[PDB]
């Protein structure tokens, strides 16, 4: 009745929330990679300027 109808917005939403988190994880994983890449490129420059 109202139970089955109520559980409807809820279950839909729970799966939406899950899908959002999974996608945002991919975004986090990509920002981490980007940060690691820059770190390595800053080093390269610093160590270059400290050797020059």
């Amino acid at each position: 009745a109202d139970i089955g109808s109520e559980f409807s917005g809820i279950v839909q939403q729970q799966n939406n929330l899950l899908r959002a988190i999974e996608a945002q994880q991919h975004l986090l994983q990509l920002t981490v990679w980007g940060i690691k890449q820059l770190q390595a490129r800053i080093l390269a420059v610093e160590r270059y300027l400290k050797s020059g």
């Binding site: 899908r19 996608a23 945002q24 991919h26």
Partner: protein, 31 residues
């Protein structure tokens, strides 16, 4: 440097893909 140009183009490509996805999901969550 070219090797770096490639990776960061892909990075941006992948960022857009998942962002667009999250937007779609968030939109759906509002209805």
């Amino acid at each position: 440097v070219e090797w770096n140009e490639m990776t960061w183009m892909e990075w941006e490509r992948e960022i857009e893909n998942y962002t667009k996805l999250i937007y779609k999901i968030l939109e759906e969550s509002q209805e």
